[PDB]
Amino acid sequence: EDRLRDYLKRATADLSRVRRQLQETEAASREPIAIIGMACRLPGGVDSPEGLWELVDSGTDAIAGFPLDRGWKEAGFLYDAGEFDAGFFGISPREAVSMDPQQRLMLEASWEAFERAGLDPARQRGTATGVFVGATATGYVSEVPEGAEGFAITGNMTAVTSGRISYTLGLQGPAVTIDTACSSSLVALHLACQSLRQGECTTALAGGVTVMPTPTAFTEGLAPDGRCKSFAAAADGTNWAEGVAVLVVERLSDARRNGHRVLAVVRGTAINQDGASNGLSAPNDLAQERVIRSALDNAGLTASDVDAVEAHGTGTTLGDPIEAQALLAAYGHERPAHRPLRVGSLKSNIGHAGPAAGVAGVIKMVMAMRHGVLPRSLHIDEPTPQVDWSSGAVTLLTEPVDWPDSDRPRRAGVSAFGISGTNAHVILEQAPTQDPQPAPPVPAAPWLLSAKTPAALRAQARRLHTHLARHPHPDPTDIAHALATTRTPHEHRAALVTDDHGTRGPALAALAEGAPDACLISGTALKGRTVFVFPGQGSQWTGMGRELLHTSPEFAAYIAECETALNDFVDWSLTDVLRGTEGAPGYDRVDVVQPALFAVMVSLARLWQHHGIHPDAVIGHSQGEIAAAHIAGALSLQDAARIVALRSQALLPLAGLGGMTSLALPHDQALQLIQPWGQDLSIASVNGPHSTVVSGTTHALDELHTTCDTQGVRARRIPVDYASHSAQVESIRDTVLQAATGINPQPTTIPLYSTVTGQPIDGTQLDADYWYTNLRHTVRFEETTRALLGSGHRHFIETTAHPVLALALEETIEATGSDARVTGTLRRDHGDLTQLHTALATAWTHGIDVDWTAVLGDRRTPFELPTYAFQRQRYWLEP
Amino acid sequence: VTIDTACSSSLVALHLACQSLRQGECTTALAGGVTVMPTPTAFTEFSRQRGLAPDGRCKSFAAAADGTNWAEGVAVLVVERLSDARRNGHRVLAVVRGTAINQDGASNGLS
Amino acid sequence: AVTLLTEPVDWPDSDRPRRAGVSAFGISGTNAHVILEQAPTQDPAPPVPAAP
Amino acid sequence: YLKRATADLSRVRRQLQETEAAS
């Protein structure tokens, strides 16, 4: 039978899906963990992973004199350990002074590591992000400011070194500070890897920090010259170093799925104990072999699969031989003698960083893998004779060596041992080849930049300019996506909108110096609700929407819907009118301009919503209230299209008998002037403190313009031959009432602030007589603006083809003294994506939240940007 | 591993011991915590923050609650996978069926 | 339905196993909760003379 | 023929359940 063939096909598919789920679940406990971001501050001016690379690549010895600015011969120091941007993290100067520099260093480094992971650290709030820190308590506070005693408690708790990161960034995964002495940061990496492999966290920070505020570790085997001569015959002790090093890790399957760039992969990790060693502080070769083999077993690898080790290599006579013996036994056998394990130690460059040493070594090996070179380990006069180097294939990195990647991925071990006896070994593997579909570019893609202060914004522009000059970079759309989706929008904002070449660079240089530029938009961001403004007459222009119909599929879809709704009440095609096709009527007719403006405003409002802008309220002017009521959910598209189409056709009998004029006078003075004409004239609208429109018969208006010519009053005749909002629309009252019959006025989903009543209105009240009243009586736009400002509205977006009420709104905002701001959508002869992006970037600049993925695309090839330009200040308790 | 997550340290230590056993890293584990106050510092510092009960009693969930108070102690557990306790013939005192750790995140203050 | 133990209460073994949660919160924000369950009830040796 | 495919699925389902329970 045929049923068995159909049954087998669906049954074997279920078996294939089940076996895959079994394989993925079994291997989850040993899944590779992607390293997606890193950050560090280490001796010798190191403040980034590339700075660390440039130090080891150039064989630099960072050991130098003790600090002169701490109230205390050479060692590895962070001379700027007290430099912190307290303002950035919401910390007061009093709280920052009594805060342990280890906590402060872990905050800036963690923010940077998330930025280098291509993650906006602010978008990590509410996520299952864990924080694992290896740290020990130091003598920063044994003298603190008065009242700052509460801050001294949390400010010097080792537990808060991890917890503070989770508090400041709103992370919900566990924050654990661990202390396994000089193996702490590598054990924290192992715990972050276990947490990710158990599904406890989605992402995690793993790192360590060391600060020596007082001279103490130097008093308690030290090298006389202060240099850690790792595995050298002249090895005569270790020396201590200050530092911070953190990583952002994630399950490799999640990094591939989320499109994060993988720097390297933690293939395996293991932790163990020396156990019964010959003394508590003494290392154990058998236990170090056991931890190396556990890391290999966990990685599913053998000794010959690992090319190099970043050894613990402190430079002590006790430790160095023991470690080399364990490396010779665990890694030196069962491998080609001509492919020996290469051994080196970052401690020869900067010193023993204690809790932070292990992850500082992981950062060094990730950079060695990405650069394809194994750098030299300093001060090796000869390989120490306390080791039998002939008993295994293990060689020291006495000079730099190239690292090939043709045959298989580069792999390296990183070790960390402690005085308390707990050991850690991690196995790193090169990031796999990332398979790139090339999406098209978006024209005039805005480049966003922001910072907490104006000085910091200038530094962001300066650093981004230097970054792009020193590095060949991808297309401007990839840089735009990285700036808009991988960086936090702070208070002081700037956007660069241009489709030309040779313009973004000089604009950044102008932004860095504080000067203006044509493509540069600046402003301070705002709390505050948003209002979509829908004017009536005046926003149209011949050719509006035609560029957007060709280049915006979203706008084309909304216009098409508007066309389907208008067809049942109109004898023309909306698409044909907007495009100006052969046979279509133009905007000279009231019955085509009002329904076309309705569709442009509705579609531009839906387009703003598509780009992530959802209005808290909507306001309309005369006809504009039909579009506003539709967006408000009160009127359906078919019902709103009916009212605007039939109401504008009802106006036709009034053609030529009247008009409208704008006066630069307040309402009371305009009403005082209009008196000698009685019902022939009416106050049509009151838009601002010095903007009133008057409407009536074409005879009384010509006489009124003659009167305004005698008195010093600015008066401009509106180009329309209908007297809307005047006693004349009483002649078409029954037809205007018929225009809105058979409508179902529904309740509002977004508040509609009526310009008929000056207050919010229930959508069910937008009945036939309401639409007659809207056309007949004064548009109280200023009063309704004043009500919106009073109810917390600070962003007004005119969803129009050209700004009409922007000056009036700004005039009202100035009268009330509010921080509010106004932006349009398109301008006359500028209805393209360049202008749409300029309006979006301008609105973003004022503090409105734009979904830049809807504008620039969901995914692009990642582009690493510089990290935040911290404006650090000195904070050091003087003892 | 020595854990410091302040007043949740030993319970976080138990969570980690449980996960270490679930991942096969350990066959058996010790999980616990210890507190000795050789100096009177915790009393002088937290009473300044008015976090301590004047009479010294932690009146858990009472209307009269007016602060906490410090105690010294040591408390340890020996844990093992339930399947290994049954196989090894060990007497099971109780089972840790579920465990979890997390963060307050963005709370109304660090403390 | 959460009541304080203002007085001791008997904890019956019948029906299902006894279960209890344990909480520990910290000043640094890291929380912990553990769920304990009663030892399973599914858990003839002749003597050895003069057993030391 | 489908008895072997169904037998394999019954084994894999049990192995998936007991592996998840072990975690």
Automatic annotation (TrEMBL), chain B:
Residues reported in the UniProt entry to bind (R)-4'-phosphopantetheine: 7, 111
Regions crossing the membrane: none
The organism's place on the tree of life at top rank: Bacteria
Protein name in the entry: Putative polyketide synthase
Annotated source species: Streptomyces lasalocidi (Streptomyces lasaliensis)
Section of the entire sequence shown: 204 to 314 of 1647
